[PDB]
């Protein structure tokens, strides 16, 4: 039975970071691609990150650079670590663990599909 659990969402300023938090039970997070999406208000949820099986990760154009993801395989979490957040940033975060495929690798980002889901976590970025 898979669970993930979002963490660490906040009002935040622009400029500044935060770091978002999704502890896996049920899968051992190394094994798959785990990945971070959002929903911004009124638009369709979006891939942001993500992570194969051997730590590679990859991002979404609108965050490269800023966005990194990483993993502590000890605690089975899962990370976001967001610099230089933006108004357009704002959003729902959700961690995802790619369950139904075979292989640590990564579909493309926005690929939504195979996937067990967390509750989310808000982030909010205000001017």
């Known amino acids: 039975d898979v669970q993930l659990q979002e963490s660490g969402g906040g009002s935040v300023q622009a400029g500044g970071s935060l770091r978002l938090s999704c502890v896996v039970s049920?899968?051992?997070?190394?094994?798959?691609?785990m990945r971070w999406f959002r929903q911004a208000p009124g638009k369709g949820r979006e891939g942001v990150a993500s992570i194969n099986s051997a730590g590679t990760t990859y991002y979404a154009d609108s965050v490269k650079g800023r966005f990194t993801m990483s993993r502590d395989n000890a605690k089975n979490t899962v990370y976001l670590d967001m610099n230089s957040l933006k108004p357009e940033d704002t959003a729902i975060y959700y961690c995802?663990?790619?369950?139904?495929?075979?292989?640590?690798?990564?579909?493309?980002?926005?690929?939504?599909?195979?996937?067990?889901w967390g509750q989310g976590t808000q982030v909010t970025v205000s001017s």
């Open positions: 049920g899968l051992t997070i190394s094994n798959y691609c």
């Open positions: 995802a663990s790619s369950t139904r495929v075979w292989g640590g690798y990564c579909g493309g980002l926005d690929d939504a599909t195979n996937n067990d």
